[PDB]
């Protein structure tokens, strides 16, 4: 029961890795921006020192491979970059584990722009256009992950919504700052636990809420 | 850890073709990335912030490392690699 | 729980000593080790050719 965006009836959990930072650069050769591997390039570009981190979404592979809802099939991952770019992933991509192979998977952002498999029947990674709401299911809950929002158990939060046909969570995969709350889709923010969680542990807490709500 | 002649590294699946095969072992078992991304998850979990957790690790070579809750493990990978080299050879890391 | 940052040197080498930030105490420690090994080798050699 694989899940694309084009069967908007069924019950899904949509994660939106929002305000990501994976950005390409031209050195003959093609690199992408890490804070660790180059800082003089950030200073010459005049960027902020801190927010050139695709390590956060590469660590948020764990919601793609959060097995007891992804091996149930009921999860789907979209990514929206600070460069305004929406990347779909398929719920059966076996993502590259190491960051050097994830660095090598910049052909989706630069060259190939949609990857096939070795037998090449189902597309894995896509560079689709905005908004997210059109690709979401018909009824869809309106949730971003803030900190100073009211805290609630995501078990009870998913359980009290009887059949809202999905649950979408906009998680800001940035270093510092503030996510687009009133800009696009979310009128109410649900806060997770009492501490300033990182993006990866926020996604994992919501994924495990979905597991123990929908009985893995 | 391993020597290059001048340099010390932590054994990856990716920093070498056959340093692991020269040492005898196979390359699939030299994965420090997964204990890195476990250590990140455990030390960003809320139970660690609440102070109800501590993280011990034990290497396949039989080396036990105690990991304080108060530590800030670095977020990228090769920063953690350079941390693990000095931990494995100086047996201690201060703040 | 408070969260401290770990102090460690980048491109660590155990066989080299630590980079002390003073060039007049690291230098005296270097040249103390140098005189100790050269004095030991020197007087070892002169007592064994005396033998």
């Amino acid at each position: 029961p694989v899940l694309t965006s084009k069967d908007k009836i069924t019950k899904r959990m949509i994660v939106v890795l929002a305000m990501a930072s994976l950005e390409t650069h031209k050195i003959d050769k093609y690199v992408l921006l890490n804070c660790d591997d180059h800082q003089g390039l950030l200073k010459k570009m005049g960027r902020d020192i801190s927010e050139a981190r695709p390590d956060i979404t590469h660590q948020c592979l764990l919601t793609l491979l959060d097995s007891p809802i992804n091996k149930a099939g009921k999860l789907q991952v979209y990514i929206q970059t600070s460069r305004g770019i929406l990347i779909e992933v398929n719920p059966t991509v076996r993502i590259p584990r190491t960051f050097k192979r994830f660095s090598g998977l910049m052909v989706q952002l630069l060259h190939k722009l949609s990857i096939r498999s070795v037998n090449s029947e189902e597309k894995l990674l896509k560079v689709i256009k905005n908004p997210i709401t059109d690709h979401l299911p018909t009824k869809c809950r309106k949730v971003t992950l803030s900190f100073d929002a009211p805290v609630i158990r995501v078990q009870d939060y998913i359980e009290k919504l009887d059949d809202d046909e999905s649950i979408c969570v906009f998680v800001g995969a940035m270093a510092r700052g503030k996510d687009n709350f009133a800009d696009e889709y979310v009128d109410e923010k649900v806060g997770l636990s009492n501490y300033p969680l990182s993006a990866s542990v926020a996604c994992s807490k919501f994924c495990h809420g979905a597991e123990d709500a929908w009985n893995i | 850890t391993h020597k290059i002649s001048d340099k010390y590294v932590l054994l990856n699946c990716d920093d070498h073709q056959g340093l692991l095969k020269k040492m005898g072992r196979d390359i699939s078992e030299a994965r420090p990335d997964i204990t890195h991304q476990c250590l990140l998850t455990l030390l960003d979990s809320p139970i660690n912030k609440a102070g109800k957790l501590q993280v011990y690790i034990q290497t396949s070579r039989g080396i036990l490392i105690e990991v304080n809750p108060t530590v800030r493990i670095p977020r990228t990978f090769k920063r953690f690699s350079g941390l693990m080299v000095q931990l494995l050879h100086k047996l201690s890391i201060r703040s | 729980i408070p969260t401290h940052a770990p102090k460690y040197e980048e491109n660590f080498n155990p066989d080299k000593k630590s980079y002390d930030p003073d060039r007049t105490r690291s230098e005296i420690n270097k040249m103390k080790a140098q005189l100790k090994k050269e004095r030991k080798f020197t007087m070892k050699e002169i007592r064994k050719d005396a033998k």
Binding site: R53, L197, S198 | R75 | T3
Partner: peptide, 19 residues
């Protein structure tokens, strides 16, 4: 207090030497 901000970079020896 490091709320996911990451521990900072430390300048290299040659970068501090070029001064």
């Amino acid at each position: 207090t490091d709320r996911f901000k990451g521990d900072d970079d430390i300048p290299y020896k040659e970068r501090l030497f070029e001064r």
